[PDB]
Amino acid sequence: ADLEDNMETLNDNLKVIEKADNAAQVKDALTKMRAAALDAQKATPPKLEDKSPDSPEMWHFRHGFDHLVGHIDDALKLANEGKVKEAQAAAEQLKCHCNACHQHYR
Amino acid sequence: ADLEDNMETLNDNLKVIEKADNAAQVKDALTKMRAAALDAQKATPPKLEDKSPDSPEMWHFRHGFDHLVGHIDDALKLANEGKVKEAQAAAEQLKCHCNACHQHYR
Ligand code: HEC
Ligand code: HEC
Ligand SMILES: [Co+2]
């Protein structure tokens, strides 16, 4: 998708996790965010369009998504083992990282 | 120390990093924060007296600290590399993580 869509596919699924009751809706939400995060990584946001392709602020921007995928992978581990309450909490650690990338590049 | 002076140790050094002038000063404050958070990790918050230390709550409280120390370590790396601007930037990103644990356990 485009960055704007991935962000929405990221946004809704965070709520799916928290209003999921079983580990199996948790796991499929995360699978989706992972793909949506890795797709948004390819993008070049508004307030860096008029800037380099090997920008340092551009590699920092793409490393935001690697860090997010890492958290997503971790919560999947908590999920796949059926540790349901743990994996919803792990997912909630994404929030700060969502916000931090906004504050700089949104 | 007790958890209240640990959180004070994290509280003051955040402003110490806010004021700081060179990489040495930022590193020393991040060093104290790391030890103040790893020690506070072993403590039990008043909101959690009547849990058992293997409860989800006390796991989420410990994990909360594991995430902070990882990001304190990221900020230590930037500071050792002489990037005082970014290490400071990475430190006040810590604050959302503090609040995220404060909104359950403070
Ligand atoms: C960078 C590494 C980011 C991370 C991690 C997250 N987001 Fe984001 N987000 C980013 C940008 C640059 C933008 C603005 C894009 C634009 O051109 O407008 C956004 C935007 C959003 C939005 C609004 C979508 C819109 O069209 O304005 C939402 C709802 C959103 N982001 C949610 C969101 C969540 C929940 C995240 C973490 C789980 C998250 N984003 C991470 C850059 C980055
Ligand atoms: C859990 C995973 C926590 C993280 C991460 C941080 N804090 Fe903390 N904080 C936590 C608890 C359980 C409490 C209650 C202390 C009490 O006994 O009531 C607090 C509170 C504080 C305080 C108040 C100290 C006081 O004497 O009342 C401060 C000043 C504070 N926290 C600072 C702080 C900072 C700056 C943090 C990250 C950078 C941080 N805390 C993380 C639990 C957790
Ligand atoms: Co993190």
Swiss-Prot record, chains A, B:
Region (Disordered) residue spans: 38-60
Compositionally biased region (Basic and acidic residues): 47-60
Keywords: Electron transport, Heme, Iron, Metal-binding, Periplasm, Signal, Transport
Keyword Heme: yes
Primary site of residence: periplasm
An MF annotation (GO) of this entry: heme binding
Biological process according to GO: electron transport chain
Cofactor binding description: Binds 1 heme b (iron(II)-protoporphyrin IX) group per molecule.
Top-level taxon of the source organism: Bacteria
Compartment(s): Periplasm
One GO CC annotation: periplasmic space
Binding site for heme b: M7, H102
Required co-factors: heme b
Quaternary structure note: Monomer.
Physiological role: Electron-transport protein of unknown function.
Family from the record: Belongs to the cytochrome b562 family.
Entry protein name: Soluble cytochrome b562
The organism's taxonomic lineage, starting at the top: Bacteria, Pseudomonadati, Pseudomonadota, Gammaproteobacteria, Enterobacterales
Protein encoded by which gene: cybC
Entire protein: shown range: 23 to 128 of 128
